[PDB]
Design a protein around this ligand. Sequence first.
Ligand code: HEM
Ligand code: HEM
Ligand SMILES: Nc1ccc2ccc(CCNCCc3cccc(F)c3)cc2n1
Ligand SMILES: Nc1ccc2ccc(CCNCCc3cccc(F)c3)cc2n1
Ligand SMILES: C[C@H](O)[C@H](O)[C@H]1CNc2nc(N)[nH]c(=O)c2N1
Ligand SMILES: C[C@H](O)[C@H](O)[C@H]1CNc2nc(N)[nH]c(=O)c2N1
Ligand SMILES: [Cl-]
Ligand SMILES: [Cl-]
Lengths: 362, 362
Amino acid sequence: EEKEILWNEAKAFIAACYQELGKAAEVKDRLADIKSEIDLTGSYVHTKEELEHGAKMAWRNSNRCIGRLFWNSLNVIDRRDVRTKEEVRDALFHHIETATNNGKIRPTITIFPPEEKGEKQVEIWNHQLIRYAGYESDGERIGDPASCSLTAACEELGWRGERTDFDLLPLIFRMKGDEQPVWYELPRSLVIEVPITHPDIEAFSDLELKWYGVPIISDMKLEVGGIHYNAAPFNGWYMGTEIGARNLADEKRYDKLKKVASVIGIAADYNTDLWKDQALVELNKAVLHSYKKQGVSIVDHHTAASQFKRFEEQAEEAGRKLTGDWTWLIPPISPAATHIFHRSYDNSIVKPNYFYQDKPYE
Amino acid sequence: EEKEILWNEAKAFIAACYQELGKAAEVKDRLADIKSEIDLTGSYVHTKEELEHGAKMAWRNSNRCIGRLFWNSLNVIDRRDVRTKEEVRDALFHHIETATNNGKIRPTITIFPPEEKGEKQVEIWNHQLIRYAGYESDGERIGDPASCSLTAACEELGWRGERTDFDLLPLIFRMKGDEQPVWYELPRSLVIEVPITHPDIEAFSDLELKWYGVPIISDMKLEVGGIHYNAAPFNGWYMGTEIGARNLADEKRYDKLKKVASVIGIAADYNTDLWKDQALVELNKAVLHSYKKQGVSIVDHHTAASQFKRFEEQAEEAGRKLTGDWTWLIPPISPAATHIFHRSYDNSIVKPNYFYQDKPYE
Ligand code: HEM
Ligand code: HEM
Ligand SMILES: Nc1ccc2ccc(CCNCCc3cccc(F)c3)cc2n1
Ligand SMILES: Nc1ccc2ccc(CCNCCc3cccc(F)c3)cc2n1
Ligand SMILES: C[C@H](O)[C@H](O)[C@H]1CNc2nc(N)[nH]c(=O)c2N1
Ligand SMILES: C[C@H](O)[C@H](O)[C@H]1CNc2nc(N)[nH]c(=O)c2N1
Ligand SMILES: [Cl-]
Ligand SMILES: [Cl-]
């Protein structure tokens, strides 16, 4: 009965994948092999080529992602061979190093062994491989509030954060058969961070803001042809607004706009002064300037949207339907200055794709 | 068969309206009267109380409107008595005067006789009662491009614009029985305009921008209990972003951001400088400042969103379902700085409501 769902997903993915790779004549034989393998084993194993193209298709199909123009150049690392926690750890360290690439970020995914009977082989607890801790007790808020529950779970396991506003969380994951996850402190030499300064307001450095170089999302499930790769961290480079208009700006995150207004020398008293808007613009200029000055890849929302327009044009030319989530594609500052705001998108879900999955803590 | 649809809409509206007005015991008798009236005449006539509350309910139910907190104070002018084009003209002139109210804008609707057999009694061609003309010929663009087709239709009728960037279109409407609409130049004494200046950048006035004081939307159909009031112009006061982030900023409108960047002294060369964002913020500050300085009502998007939060809270307390269109409620600048961006809304259509209808020209 589950062999049923699997086989159907397999037929659809292999046909599509092989068409795209110019291997259409190999489909019959490959599906025959797949069919025996499911019958006998309950599952099937992707070839390296299928897995690579599958991860790339999954990015291409991610409705909420504005960065999809570059789907075909995703660097896919096949780590289906790992069996021990040390191998998982070192694969994760390697992903950070190779993705970071001295600042010239390479969009990369590392793919771990997939679920078997819906049994995870490896279960990653981090939201991103590099992320700051958050604390709150006695009204006192420190660090990143979005990290509060994982931070508390880490401190249940014997880790202790220094309680700066920018503590790096350890890697934390659980192996099949183990009751508890293990954790490993990140080697600081692997983690690039960028201090936030402003191109012409010298006092901006008084805020002592920084952010990390590479967002490596590690809690989503990659699904390809019926196979569920629950552990498959991936990364791009940041779009500036993610950091300047959300991470550093949201009231439920670092909540810095009032402090930004003060250092740029404007009053934060009247809604009609649009001081939040002005502060947002200067904070976002600072983030882009700072990443560029440090030689870490980043894209601004205008350039990103113009890349996405090319992705739309490419989809049409290739004869593929385009799907998108308008509510996530529009950037959180000046959305009406992008073409995205002025058209609509079909939010249908197409596989292969990346999906949310339940948190193992909380 | 149409008596069927009408009667059903009537039952639902009268029951709801009368509950809200504390008149629930009068429903049976009123519906009885309505039922005879439909049988004998094919339609029914709203009482002044029903029409007033109906227009207010229609505003309350307008999913795309952020200004709905004030739905219950709408000033409803009943002009179902008009029969001649001079009466229509003078009703429209009066609406402008009373809505404008020397700058202290009163949200107002003037309701004209409704459709009969789906036959319009009065057909208004203007999109808004006050709006600028637009022209394009030989690559030359003048005025408001969104007004190009109505401008051309007006010039078919013997009107001629001066071809400034801010020509006021005449009122234009057609009476039942007439083959062509008539047009009337707006008396300039009735129309408040606001020159756009900046609170601290003196050169901003070099752009010679202005906008009109009151948006009076005149091409939507009000539907109340099965009755179709196709001619029922209404107005609020502006939210600043409508003017500063869209009318004056959109590339397909006045397209002023490059000129704004120049007068505020920033380069418009690099996407990473966020010059469009900075220009948008200063243009939007200027619009709010200018309206305030002239004593014409206006609201900024932050205050508007906080009013809308109160509307949401009021709906819950009153036990009413809330409906909304997230894609229109978020403002076009700093949307993530409003609570609207961070929740979702049910976009279901509830009547009474305002609806689009087909243009009579083009
Ligand atoms: C190359 C640079 C990239 C840029 C600039 C980019 C940009 C973005 C942005 C701005 C978002 C919205 C995030 C948010 O608001 O939380 C996003 C969402 C997303 N991106 Fe990309 N992206 C890139 C690469 C990638 C890659 C390599 C993948 C996967 C292979 C990916 C998959 C996704 C997915 C799945 C989401 C949606 C996440 C969710 O629903 O929570 N992106 N992207
Ligand atoms: C009192 C001040 C008001 C403010 C500040 C306000 C604000 C707004 C804004 C900003 C929009 C979006 C417009 C756009 O992007 O084109 C809007 C839409 C709308 N408003 Fe309001 N509004 C107000 C009063 C009213 C009144 C009095 C009515 C009717 C009685 C009304 C009915 C609507 C409708 C129907 C729409 C949607 C129009 C469409 O779909 O094209 N509003 N409002
Ligand atoms: N620049 C990029 C590249 C790839 C990305 C891939 C995924 C994402 C989504 C990250 N945010 C998901 C929503 C979320 C989850 C958990 C906490 C939050 F604050 C927000 C962002 C990306 N940004
Ligand atoms: N401030 C207000 C108050 C009431 C309003 C009622 C309705 C509207 C919608 C006006 N715009 C409709 C969309 C449209 C139509 C025609 C040309 C355009 F450029 C845009 C705006 C309002 N703004
Ligand atoms: C409620 C709302 O739809 C939702 O919280 C979204 C809106 N659009 C977004 N878009 C992006 N890119 N990221 C987000 O976190 C959100 N939040
Ligand atoms: C395509 C897109 O959904 C659409 O053009 C909308 C987006 N949201 C909007 N929201 C408002 N308030 N006004 C508009 O004109 C638009 N344009
Ligand atoms: Cl992030
Ligand atoms: Cl307008």
